[PDB]
mmCIF file of C-alpha atoms (C1' of nucleotides) and ligand atoms in Angstrom:
data_model
loop_
_atom_site.group_PDB
_atom_site.id
_atom_site.type_symbol
_atom_site.label_atom_id
_atom_site.label_comp_id
_atom_site.label_asym_id
_atom_site.label_seq_id
_atom_site.Cartn_x
_atom_site.Cartn_y
_atom_site.Cartn_z
ATOM 1 C CA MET A 1 -0.256 0.131 0.055
ATOM 2 C CA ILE A 2 1.087 3.473 -0.896
ATOM 3 C CA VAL A 3 -0.250 6.220 0.710
ATOM 4 C CA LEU A 4 -0.026 9.939 0.201
ATOM 5 C CA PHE A 5 -1.179 12.174 2.687
ATOM 6 C CA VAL A 6 -1.910 16.093 2.290
ATOM 7 C CA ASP A 7 -1.859 18.957 4.985
ATOM 8 C CA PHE A 8 -2.666 22.280 4.079
ATOM 9 C CA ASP A 9 -0.109 24.862 5.809
ATOM 10 C CA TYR A 10 -1.045 27.227 8.360
ATOM 11 C CA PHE A 11 -4.685 26.942 6.570
ATOM 12 C CA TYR A 12 -6.850 29.183 8.347
ATOM 13 C CA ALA A 13 -3.839 32.096 7.905
ATOM 14 C CA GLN A 14 -3.315 31.105 4.504
ATOM 15 C CA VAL A 15 -6.908 31.393 3.387
ATOM 16 C CA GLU A 16 -6.977 34.960 4.840
ATOM 17 C CA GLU A 17 -4.155 35.630 2.768
ATOM 18 C CA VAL A 18 -5.623 34.360 -0.427
ATOM 19 C CA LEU A 19 -8.730 36.633 0.201
ATOM 20 C CA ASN A 20 -6.447 39.594 0.876
ATOM 21 C CA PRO A 21 -2.905 39.225 -0.875
ATOM 22 C CA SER A 22 -1.525 42.189 1.183
ATOM 23 C CA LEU A 23 -1.416 39.995 4.084
ATOM 24 C CA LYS A 24 1.248 38.421 2.705
ATOM 25 C CA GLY A 25 4.657 38.535 4.490
ATOM 26 C CA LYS A 26 3.025 39.975 7.835
ATOM 27 C CA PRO A 27 2.498 37.842 10.597
ATOM 28 C CA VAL A 28 -1.366 36.799 10.828
ATOM 29 C CA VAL A 29 -3.291 35.683 13.651
ATOM 30 C CA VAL A 30 -6.801 33.830 13.322
ATOM 31 C CA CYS A 31 -8.487 34.376 16.671
ATOM 32 C CA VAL A 32 -11.372 32.746 18.324
ATOM 33 C CA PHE A 33 -12.790 35.728 20.036
ATOM 34 C CA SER A 34 -14.922 34.565 23.146
ATOM 35 C CA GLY A 35 -16.737 37.966 24.080
ATOM 36 C CA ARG A 36 -16.272 37.946 27.933
ATOM 37 C CA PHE A 37 -13.977 41.041 27.467
ATOM 38 C CA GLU A 38 -11.633 42.703 25.053
ATOM 39 C CA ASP A 39 -9.322 40.226 23.338
ATOM 40 C CA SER A 40 -10.590 37.421 25.377
ATOM 41 C CA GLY A 41 -10.305 34.069 23.561
ATOM 42 C CA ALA A 42 -7.723 31.803 21.902
ATOM 43 C CA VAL A 43 -5.611 31.793 18.873
ATOM 44 C CA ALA A 44 -6.655 29.429 16.351
ATOM 45 C CA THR A 45 -3.515 29.252 14.084
ATOM 46 C CA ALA A 46 -1.155 31.862 12.788
ATOM 47 C CA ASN A 47 0.890 31.859 9.657
ATOM 48 C CA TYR A 48 4.998 31.307 10.227
ATOM 49 C CA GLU A 49 5.832 34.805 10.397
ATOM 50 C CA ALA A 50 3.797 34.932 13.809
ATOM 51 C CA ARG A 51 4.602 31.656 14.727
ATOM 52 C CA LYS A 52 8.411 32.189 14.655
ATOM 53 C CA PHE A 53 8.058 34.569 17.808
ATOM 54 C CA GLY A 54 6.280 31.950 19.588
ATOM 55 C CA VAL A 55 2.397 33.113 18.736
ATOM 56 C CA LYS A 56 0.713 29.690 17.831
ATOM 57 C CA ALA A 57 -2.369 27.858 17.932
ATOM 58 C CA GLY A 58 -3.828 27.702 21.530
ATOM 59 C CA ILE A 59 -2.261 30.650 23.404
ATOM 60 C CA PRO A 60 -4.621 33.408 24.709
ATOM 61 C CA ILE A 61 -5.164 36.240 22.283
ATOM 62 C CA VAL A 62 -3.970 38.458 25.167
ATOM 63 C CA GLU A 63 -0.590 36.851 25.145
ATOM 64 C CA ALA A 64 0.068 37.077 21.414
ATOM 65 C CA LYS A 65 -0.744 40.706 21.545
ATOM 66 C CA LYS A 66 1.996 41.340 24.245
ATOM 67 C CA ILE A 67 4.361 39.378 21.790
ATOM 68 C CA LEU A 68 3.178 40.827 18.562
ATOM 69 C CA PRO A 69 0.911 43.951 19.019
ATOM 70 C CA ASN A 70 1.379 44.649 15.961
ATOM 71 C CA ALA A 71 0.591 41.508 13.834
ATOM 72 C CA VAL A 72 -2.972 41.314 12.237
ATOM 73 C CA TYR A 73 -5.771 39.593 14.012
ATOM 74 C CA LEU A 74 -8.591 38.413 12.137
ATOM 75 C CA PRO A 75 -11.788 36.453 13.615
ATOM 76 C CA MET A 76 -11.741 33.045 12.598
ATOM 77 C CA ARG A 77 -14.513 32.560 9.730
ATOM 78 C CA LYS A 78 -14.631 28.701 9.424
ATOM 79 C CA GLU A 79 -17.417 28.821 6.867
ATOM 80 C CA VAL A 80 -15.271 30.122 4.455
ATOM 81 C CA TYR A 81 -12.145 28.212 5.402
ATOM 82 C CA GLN A 82 -14.755 25.187 5.029
ATOM 83 C CA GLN A 83 -15.532 26.001 1.484
ATOM 84 C CA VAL A 84 -12.393 26.510 0.286
ATOM 85 C CA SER A 85 -11.536 22.990 1.880
ATOM 86 C CA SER A 86 -14.302 21.235 0.166
ATOM 87 C CA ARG A 87 -13.148 22.792 -2.832
ATOM 88 C CA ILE A 88 -9.426 21.302 -2.403
ATOM 89 C CA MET A 89 -10.588 18.294 -1.687
ATOM 90 C CA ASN A 90 -12.688 17.454 -4.544
ATOM 91 C CA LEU A 91 -9.203 18.222 -6.854
ATOM 92 C CA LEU A 92 -7.927 15.496 -4.667
ATOM 93 C CA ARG A 93 -10.529 12.735 -5.579
ATOM 94 C CA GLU A 94 -9.266 13.527 -9.490
ATOM 95 C CA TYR A 95 -6.272 11.573 -7.908
ATOM 96 C CA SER A 96 -8.011 8.889 -6.185
ATOM 97 C CA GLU A 97 -11.146 7.103 -5.327
ATOM 98 C CA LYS A 98 -9.824 5.941 -2.138
ATOM 99 C CA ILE A 99 -9.736 8.842 -0.210
ATOM 100 C CA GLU A 100 -9.795 9.525 3.605
ATOM 101 C CA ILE A 101 -10.556 13.292 4.833
ATOM 102 C CA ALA A 102 -9.089 13.102 8.188
ATOM 103 C CA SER A 103 -10.068 17.061 9.197
ATOM 104 C CA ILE A 104 -10.897 20.264 7.568
ATOM 105 C CA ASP A 105 -7.312 20.480 6.310
ATOM 106 C CA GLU A 106 -5.969 16.566 6.219
ATOM 107 C CA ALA A 107 -6.744 14.049 3.659
ATOM 108 C CA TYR A 108 -5.118 10.349 2.808
ATOM 109 C CA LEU A 109 -4.990 8.992 -0.605
ATOM 110 C CA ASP A 110 -4.536 5.505 -1.286
ATOM 111 C CA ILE A 111 -2.500 5.568 -4.679
ATOM 112 C CA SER A 112 -1.528 1.801 -4.548
ATOM 113 C CA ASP A 113 -3.491 1.431 -7.947
ATOM 114 C CA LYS A 114 -2.077 4.975 -9.460
ATOM 115 C CA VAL A 115 1.709 4.495 -8.940
ATOM 116 C CA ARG A 116 3.986 1.629 -8.878
ATOM 117 C CA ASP A 117 7.007 2.995 -6.863
ATOM 118 C CA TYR A 118 8.023 5.893 -4.383
ATOM 119 C CA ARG A 119 9.253 7.655 -7.076
ATOM 120 C CA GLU A 120 5.975 8.022 -9.520
ATOM 121 C CA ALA A 121 4.509 8.884 -5.917
ATOM 122 C CA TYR A 122 6.460 11.429 -5.358
ATOM 123 C CA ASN A 123 5.962 13.095 -9.031
ATOM 124 C CA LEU A 124 2.405 12.627 -8.317
ATOM 125 C CA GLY A 125 2.617 14.753 -5.116
ATOM 126 C CA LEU A 126 4.099 17.204 -7.291
ATOM 127 C CA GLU A 127 1.338 16.971 -9.528
ATOM 128 C CA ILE A 128 -1.015 17.500 -6.790
ATOM 129 C CA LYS A 129 0.761 20.710 -4.958
ATOM 130 C CA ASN A 130 0.751 22.250 -8.476
ATOM 131 C CA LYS A 131 -2.587 21.680 -9.139
ATOM 132 C CA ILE A 132 -3.555 23.142 -5.653
ATOM 133 C CA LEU A 133 -1.513 25.856 -6.088
ATOM 134 C CA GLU A 134 -2.632 26.607 -9.420
ATOM 135 C CA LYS A 135 -6.411 26.095 -8.633
ATOM 136 C CA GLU A 136 -6.387 27.897 -5.208
ATOM 137 C CA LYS A 137 -3.224 29.380 -4.491
ATOM 138 C CA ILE A 138 -2.810 27.159 -1.325
ATOM 139 C CA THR A 139 0.628 25.396 -0.499
ATOM 140 C CA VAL A 140 0.331 22.059 1.371
ATOM 141 C CA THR A 141 2.825 19.389 2.376
ATOM 142 C CA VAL A 142 2.941 15.987 0.942
ATOM 143 C CA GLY A 143 4.056 13.313 2.866
ATOM 144 C CA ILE A 144 4.325 9.604 1.651
ATOM 145 C CA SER A 145 4.948 5.994 2.704
ATOM 146 C CA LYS A 146 3.696 2.622 3.392
ATOM 147 C CA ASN A 147 0.745 3.599 5.835
ATOM 148 C CA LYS A 148 -1.158 6.524 7.150
ATOM 149 C CA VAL A 149 0.784 7.000 10.370
ATOM 150 C CA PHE A 150 4.054 7.439 8.366
ATOM 151 C CA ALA A 151 2.863 9.166 5.513
ATOM 152 C CA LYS A 152 1.614 11.593 8.133
ATOM 153 C CA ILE A 153 5.004 11.782 9.898
ATOM 154 C CA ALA A 154 6.359 12.488 6.687
ATOM 155 C CA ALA A 155 4.434 15.202 6.370
ATOM 156 C CA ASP A 156 4.904 16.442 9.941
ATOM 157 C CA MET A 157 9.095 16.537 9.154
ATOM 158 C CA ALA A 158 8.520 18.374 5.477
ATOM 159 C CA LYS A 159 6.030 21.179 6.403
ATOM 160 C CA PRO A 160 5.438 23.712 5.477
ATOM 161 C CA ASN A 161 5.207 23.529 1.603
ATOM 162 C CA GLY A 162 7.102 20.465 1.460
ATOM 163 C CA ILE A 163 7.146 16.909 0.562
ATOM 164 C CA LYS A 164 8.519 13.807 1.673
ATOM 165 C CA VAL A 165 8.857 9.857 1.087
ATOM 166 C CA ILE A 166 9.706 7.754 3.878
ATOM 167 C CA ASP A 167 10.571 4.171 2.116
ATOM 168 C CA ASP A 168 10.364 1.044 3.903
ATOM 169 C CA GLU A 169 14.280 1.576 5.021
ATOM 170 C CA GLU A 170 13.657 4.725 6.841
ATOM 171 C CA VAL A 171 10.373 3.258 8.309
ATOM 172 C CA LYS A 172 12.483 0.673 10.445
ATOM 173 C CA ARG A 173 15.052 3.416 10.844
ATOM 174 C CA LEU A 174 12.397 5.477 12.540
ATOM 175 C CA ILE A 175 11.259 2.666 14.555
ATOM 176 C CA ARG A 176 14.108 2.610 16.429
ATOM 177 C CA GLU A 177 15.195 6.414 16.213
ATOM 178 C CA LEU A 178 11.627 8.180 16.028
ATOM 179 C CA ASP A 179 11.033 9.871 19.116
ATOM 180 C CA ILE A 180 7.730 8.156 20.196
ATOM 181 C CA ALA A 181 6.046 11.229 21.185
ATOM 182 C CA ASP A 182 6.182 12.403 17.591
ATOM 183 C CA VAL A 183 3.720 9.402 16.983
ATOM 184 C CA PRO A 184 0.250 10.408 15.500
ATOM 185 C CA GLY A 185 -2.090 9.593 18.529
ATOM 186 C CA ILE A 186 0.301 9.959 21.475
ATOM 187 C CA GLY A 187 -0.295 12.840 23.437
ATOM 188 C CA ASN A 188 1.161 14.751 26.403
ATOM 189 C CA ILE A 189 -0.644 12.077 29.006
ATOM 190 C CA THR A 190 0.406 9.265 26.932
ATOM 191 C CA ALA A 191 3.985 10.284 26.305
ATOM 192 C CA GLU A 192 4.403 10.778 30.051
ATOM 193 C CA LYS A 193 3.351 7.590 30.992
ATOM 194 C CA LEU A 194 5.561 5.705 28.095
ATOM 195 C CA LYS A 195 8.588 7.910 29.412
ATOM 196 C CA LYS A 196 7.610 6.436 32.945
ATOM 197 C CA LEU A 197 8.831 3.137 31.609
ATOM 198 C CA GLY A 198 11.908 4.142 29.617
ATOM 199 C CA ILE A 199 9.912 3.652 26.385
ATOM 200 C CA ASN A 200 10.980 6.568 24.278
ATOM 201 C CA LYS A 201 10.929 4.647 20.737
ATOM 202 C CA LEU A 202 8.752 2.453 19.215
ATOM 203 C CA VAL A 203 11.080 -0.547 19.510
ATOM 204 C CA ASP A 204 10.992 -0.313 22.992
ATOM 205 C CA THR A 205 7.281 -1.748 22.877
ATOM 206 C CA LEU A 206 8.793 -4.826 21.547
ATOM 207 C CA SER A 207 10.655 -5.472 24.774
ATOM 208 C CA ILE A 208 8.488 -4.715 27.343
ATOM 209 C CA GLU A 209 5.969 -6.942 28.839
ATOM 210 C CA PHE A 210 2.573 -6.245 27.098
ATOM 211 C CA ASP A 211 0.113 -6.444 30.266
ATOM 212 C CA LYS A 212 2.746 -4.129 31.474
ATOM 213 C CA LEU A 213 2.450 -1.936 28.858
ATOM 214 C CA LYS A 214 -1.448 -2.292 28.535
ATOM 215 C CA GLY A 215 -2.422 -1.704 32.052
ATOM 216 C CA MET A 216 -0.243 1.540 31.753
ATOM 217 C CA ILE A 217 -1.701 2.967 28.584
ATOM 218 C CA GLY A 218 -4.635 1.172 27.807
ATOM 219 C CA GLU A 219 -5.151 -2.063 25.463
ATOM 220 C CA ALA A 220 -5.884 0.139 22.456
ATOM 221 C CA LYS A 221 -2.922 2.148 22.225
ATOM 222 C CA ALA A 222 -0.619 -0.777 23.275
ATOM 223 C CA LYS A 223 -1.754 -3.103 20.305
ATOM 224 C CA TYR A 224 -1.669 0.290 18.285
ATOM 225 C CA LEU A 225 2.052 1.077 19.131
ATOM 226 C CA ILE A 226 3.087 -2.530 19.130
ATOM 227 C CA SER A 227 1.825 -3.203 15.773
ATOM 228 C CA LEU A 228 3.379 -0.164 14.391
ATOM 229 C CA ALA A 229 6.926 -1.509 16.053
ATOM 230 C CA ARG A 230 6.645 -4.729 14.214
ATOM 231 C CA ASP A 231 6.354 -2.563 10.801
ATOM 232 C CA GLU A 232 2.798 -4.336 10.557
ATOM 233 C CA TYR A 233 0.226 -1.262 10.753
ATOM 234 C CA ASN A 234 -1.682 -0.685 7.871
ATOM 235 C CA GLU A 235 -5.207 0.564 8.459
ATOM 236 C CA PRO A 236 -6.904 1.104 5.210
ATOM 237 C CA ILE A 237 -7.734 4.587 3.700
ATOM 238 C CA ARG A 238 -11.827 4.727 4.633
ATOM 239 C CA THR A 239 -14.250 7.551 3.800
ATOM 240 C CA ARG A 240 -14.716 9.013 7.123
ATOM 241 C CA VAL A 241 -18.528 9.239 8.838
ATOM 242 C CA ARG A 242 -18.628 12.017 11.228
ATOM 243 C CA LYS A 243 -20.010 10.183 14.129
ATOM 244 C CA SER A 244 -21.476 13.050 15.895
ATOM 245 C CA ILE A 245 -22.215 16.675 15.573
ATOM 246 C CA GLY A 246 -22.350 19.133 18.005
ATOM 247 C CA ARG A 247 -22.139 22.774 19.612
ATOM 248 C CA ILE A 248 -20.825 24.511 22.432
ATOM 249 C CA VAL A 249 -20.652 27.905 23.452
ATOM 250 C CA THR A 250 -19.032 30.274 26.327
ATOM 251 C CA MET A 251 -21.275 31.923 28.385
ATOM 252 C CA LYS A 252 -20.976 35.985 29.356
ATOM 253 C CA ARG A 253 -20.499 35.111 32.741
ATOM 254 C CA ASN A 254 -20.539 32.031 34.844
ATOM 255 C CA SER A 255 -23.256 30.191 36.696
ATOM 256 C CA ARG A 256 -25.267 27.325 37.988
ATOM 257 C CA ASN A 257 -28.940 29.179 37.309
ATOM 258 C CA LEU A 258 -30.404 26.933 34.792
ATOM 259 C CA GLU A 259 -32.747 29.611 33.572
ATOM 260 C CA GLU A 260 -29.729 31.822 32.918
ATOM 261 C CA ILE A 261 -28.022 28.807 30.943
ATOM 262 C CA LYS A 262 -30.994 27.866 28.820
ATOM 263 C CA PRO A 263 -30.599 30.696 26.209
ATOM 264 C CA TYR A 264 -27.312 29.378 25.783
ATOM 265 C CA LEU A 265 -28.457 25.387 25.920
ATOM 266 C CA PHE A 266 -31.083 26.534 23.526
ATOM 267 C CA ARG A 267 -29.028 28.215 20.938
ATOM 268 C CA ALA A 268 -26.510 25.759 20.954
ATOM 269 C CA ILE A 269 -29.365 23.317 19.590
ATOM 270 C CA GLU A 270 -30.326 25.534 17.120
ATOM 271 C CA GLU A 271 -26.924 25.793 15.564
ATOM 272 C CA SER A 272 -26.578 22.115 16.081
ATOM 273 C CA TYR A 273 -29.697 20.724 14.370
ATOM 274 C CA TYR A 274 -28.499 22.949 11.469
ATOM 275 C CA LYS A 275 -25.107 21.459 11.270
ATOM 276 C CA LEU A 276 -27.006 18.290 11.454
ATOM 277 C CA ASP A 277 -28.505 19.131 7.928
ATOM 278 C CA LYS A 278 -31.027 15.844 7.088
ATOM 279 C CA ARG A 279 -29.168 13.948 9.728
ATOM 280 C CA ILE A 280 -31.268 12.385 12.615
ATOM 281 C CA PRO A 281 -29.902 11.710 15.643
ATOM 282 C CA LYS A 282 -30.955 9.038 18.287
ATOM 283 C CA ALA A 283 -28.529 10.382 20.897
ATOM 284 C CA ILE A 284 -28.116 13.304 22.465
ATOM 285 C CA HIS A 285 -25.465 14.688 25.348
ATOM 286 C CA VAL A 286 -25.296 18.337 26.922
ATOM 287 C CA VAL A 287 -21.981 19.059 27.871
ATOM 288 C CA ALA A 288 -20.488 21.721 30.423
ATOM 289 C CA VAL A 289 -17.342 23.298 30.881
ATOM 290 C CA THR A 290 -16.976 23.997 34.666
ATOM 291 C CA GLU A 291 -15.528 27.077 36.019
ATOM 292 C CA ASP A 292 -12.211 25.254 36.859
ATOM 293 C CA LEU A 293 -12.455 23.770 33.092
ATOM 294 C CA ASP A 294 -13.098 20.010 33.950
ATOM 295 C CA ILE A 295 -15.791 18.510 31.513
ATOM 296 C CA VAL A 296 -18.998 17.508 32.669
ATOM 297 C CA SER A 297 -21.381 15.457 30.371
ATOM 298 C CA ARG A 298 -24.677 13.713 30.948
ATOM 299 C CA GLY A 299 -26.623 12.495 28.186
ATOM 300 C CA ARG A 300 -29.206 9.715 26.926
ATOM 301 C CA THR A 301 -30.200 7.356 23.679
ATOM 302 C CA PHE A 302 -33.521 7.217 22.435
ATOM 303 C CA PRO A 303 -35.058 4.104 20.626
ATOM 304 C CA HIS A 304 -35.982 6.022 17.836
ATOM 305 C CA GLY A 305 -34.765 9.537 15.932
ATOM 306 C CA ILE A 306 -34.778 12.863 18.251
ATOM 307 C CA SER A 307 -37.275 15.874 17.300
ATOM 308 C CA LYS A 308 -35.972 19.171 18.248
ATOM 309 C CA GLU A 309 -38.694 19.627 20.378
ATOM 310 C CA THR A 310 -37.602 16.582 22.024
ATOM 311 C CA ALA A 311 -34.065 17.637 22.109
ATOM 312 C CA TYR A 312 -35.223 20.610 23.650
ATOM 313 C CA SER A 313 -37.217 19.250 26.725
ATOM 314 C CA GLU A 314 -34.509 16.338 27.081
ATOM 315 C CA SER A 315 -31.670 18.606 26.748
ATOM 316 C CA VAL A 316 -32.751 20.501 30.195
ATOM 317 C CA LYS A 317 -33.014 16.999 32.392
ATOM 318 C CA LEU A 318 -29.701 16.424 31.278
ATOM 319 C CA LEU A 319 -28.576 19.822 32.358
ATOM 320 C CA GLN A 320 -30.052 19.636 35.585
ATOM 321 C CA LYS A 321 -28.789 16.134 36.362
ATOM 322 C CA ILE A 322 -25.164 17.787 35.651
ATOM 323 C CA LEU A 323 -26.343 20.521 37.914
ATOM 324 C CA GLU A 324 -27.222 17.992 40.734
ATOM 325 C CA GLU A 325 -24.066 15.876 40.162
ATOM 326 C CA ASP A 326 -21.929 18.907 40.075
ATOM 327 C CA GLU A 327 -21.766 21.869 42.403
ATOM 328 C CA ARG A 328 -19.857 23.721 40.184
ATOM 329 C CA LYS A 329 -20.320 27.027 38.492
ATOM 330 C CA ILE A 330 -20.503 26.619 34.518
ATOM 331 C CA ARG A 331 -18.193 28.728 32.068
ATOM 332 C CA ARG A 332 -19.241 27.134 28.909
ATOM 333 C CA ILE A 333 -22.450 25.479 27.835
ATOM 334 C CA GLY A 334 -23.188 23.020 24.738
ATOM 335 C CA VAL A 335 -24.876 19.974 23.214
ATOM 336 C CA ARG A 336 -24.133 16.968 21.265
ATOM 337 C CA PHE A 337 -26.037 14.625 19.080
ATOM 338 C CA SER A 338 -24.756 11.412 17.871
ATOM 339 C CA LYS A 339 -26.031 7.755 16.285
ATOM 340 C CA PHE A 340 -27.367 9.133 13.319
ATOM 341 C CA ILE A 341 -30.222 7.013 11.690
ATOM 342 C "C1'" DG B 1 -16.815 -16.118 28.924
ATOM 343 C "C1'" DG B 2 -18.075 -13.122 25.871
ATOM 344 C "C1'" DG B 3 -21.591 -10.210 22.412
ATOM 345 C "C1'" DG B 4 -23.487 -6.046 22.522
ATOM 346 C "C1'" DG B 5 -24.764 -1.853 23.813
ATOM 347 C "C1'" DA B 6 -25.312 2.295 26.771
ATOM 348 C "C1'" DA B 7 -23.386 5.692 29.885
ATOM 349 C "C1'" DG B 8 -19.578 8.742 31.482
ATOM 350 C "C1'" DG B 9 -15.025 10.223 31.698
ATOM 351 C "C1'" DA B 10 -10.213 9.785 29.478
ATOM 352 C "C1'" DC B 11 -7.555 11.367 25.740
ATOM 353 C "C1'" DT B 12 -6.079 13.671 21.267
ATOM 354 C "C1'" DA B 13 -6.315 17.535 19.130
ATOM 355 C "C1'" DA B 14 -7.613 21.744 17.450
ATOM 356 C "C1'" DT C 1 -9.300 38.554 33.362
ATOM 357 C "C1'" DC C 2 -6.195 32.681 30.456
ATOM 358 C "C1'" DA C 3 -8.015 29.060 29.157
ATOM 359 C "C1'" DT C 4 -11.563 28.202 21.588
ATOM 360 C "C1'" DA C 5 -15.025 19.726 18.090
ATOM 361 C "C1'" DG C 6 -14.924 14.677 18.213
ATOM 362 C "C1'" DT C 7 -13.508 10.182 19.106
ATOM 363 C "C1'" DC C 8 -12.917 6.295 21.501
ATOM 364 C "C1'" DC C 9 -11.545 3.733 26.125
ATOM 365 C "C1'" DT C 10 -13.332 1.605 30.649
ATOM 366 C "C1'" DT C 11 -16.971 -0.005 33.332
ATOM 367 C "C1'" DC C 12 -21.610 -2.460 34.886
ATOM 368 C "C1'" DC C 13 -25.258 -4.533 32.927
ATOM 369 C "C1'" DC C 14 -28.579 -7.578 30.702
ATOM 370 C "C1'" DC C 15 -28.159 -12.128 29.008
ATOM 371 C "C1'" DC C 16 -27.167 -16.240 26.020
HETATM 372 N N1 ATP D 1 -5.723 25.297 19.198
HETATM 373 C C1 ATP D 1 -6.267 25.408 18.035
HETATM 374 N N2 ATP D 1 -7.671 25.425 18.000
HETATM 375 C C2 ATP D 1 -8.602 25.328 17.030
HETATM 376 N N3 ATP D 1 -8.481 25.221 15.654
HETATM 377 C C3 ATP D 1 -7.037 25.120 15.712
HETATM 378 C C4 ATP D 1 -5.849 24.966 16.535
HETATM 379 N N4 ATP D 1 -4.997 24.507 16.287
HETATM 380 C C5 ATP D 1 -5.153 24.297 15.212
HETATM 381 N N5 ATP D 1 -6.348 24.542 14.348
HETATM 382 C C6 ATP D 1 -7.252 24.624 13.345
HETATM 383 O O1 ATP D 1 -6.809 23.339 12.553
HETATM 384 C C7 ATP D 1 -6.591 23.830 11.234
HETATM 385 C C8 ATP D 1 -5.567 22.755 10.522
HETATM 386 O O2 ATP D 1 -4.594 22.041 11.587
HETATM 387 P P1 ATP D 1 -2.972 22.037 11.532
HETATM 388 O O3 ATP D 1 -2.369 21.745 12.762
HETATM 389 O O4 ATP D 1 -2.860 21.132 10.448
HETATM 390 O O5 ATP D 1 -3.039 23.575 11.107
HETATM 391 P P2 ATP D 1 -1.954 24.652 10.656
HETATM 392 O O6 ATP D 1 -2.264 25.501 11.928
HETATM 393 O O7 ATP D 1 -1.640 25.348 9.385
HETATM 394 O O8 ATP D 1 -0.419 23.811 11.090
HETATM 395 P P3 ATP D 1 0.594 22.854 10.189
HETATM 396 O O9 ATP D 1 1.160 23.877 9.240
HETATM 397 O O10 ATP D 1 1.515 22.277 11.227
HETATM 398 O O11 ATP D 1 -0.468 21.864 9.774
HETATM 399 C C9 ATP D 1 -5.963 25.068 11.257
HETATM 400 O O12 ATP D 1 -5.896 25.810 10.097
HETATM 401 C C10 ATP D 1 -6.541 25.857 12.763
HETATM 402 MG MG1 MG D 2 -2.781 18.978 10.596
HETATM 403 MG MG1 MG D 3 -1.863 21.666 8.264
#
DNA sequence: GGGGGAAGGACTAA
DNA sequence: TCATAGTCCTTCCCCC
């Protein structure tokens, strides 16, 4: 299997550039303004001009302004980025029916039946970068290898505006050298549990007692890491099916007053159903972001489709169940639907 | 012993 | 006042 992975570069920021060419060269910061106070919120992303100085996805807009008070700050326009994204995905289908859209800016193409070696793949990668730059003036990084995971690692190494192949020999090389924390699926919490076992390279997972690793990081991740170690991982590229759709919204001020949170809850439902678009969910969950940031969630599954009417009354029950089972004030409130028919 | 689903918190990522 | 969507893992639970 020859997988080709595509990841758009500093996407939201780059799209803002394409719609306003005069931003080219200046640090650009796309923000999610929460609204409780001027400059409240986080950075969704930044171009490399801004990123070069420490301004990057996740930090408070406040900080970014202290680092680069003169960078361009723009409100995130997801709808716009999503349409640009869809158009790019379509260009990708012209290269393989077997395509997996991982996120708004990531996709895997199984090009096994399109090329015969990593040389042709590489050229096809170039064709793709030029096609996109051409049609949408968007630069992307291409990663090529024998499976989804390494194709993604290839990309991580070559970004931005790059392209890299990781042949079988380099795979085995990485299995021993590559820092295990840089493996897709391994987060901080998991990276830590691993270090606490001397495990710092994939190979180290082959020498350790399984049940020992399993009891530490869970059975699924254990099998995942090992299979990668044995150079055996090869999950198929498959059309993705969003299993759930929801929306969570931050409130002006925290509280635990049902009637004061209702507005937000309902606003979150209207926005969600909209997104549902044709989909009828059989399950629903009300999600809460406590003052301390912990997450409290209570949901329920029904034996049939959920009407917006139901969603309404039902969400209030779940909301209160949360209210009674947690004495914390709520910072953000949202809803989430799943188990579509 | 395990198929299978429902619920709640974990974990990645974003 | 710093703090922005989704997928699974783990557990209990009915039950063949
Ligand atoms: N912390 C974040 N919060 C919300 N959205 C984020 C965050 N980080 C990234 N994104 C969104 O996801 C998109 C895709 O993510 P990705 O990490 O690939 O993008 P990027 O910011 O361009 O960086 P890279 O060039 O390394 O891919 C971004 O354009 C945005
Ligand atoms: Mg990405
Ligand atoms: Mg990207």
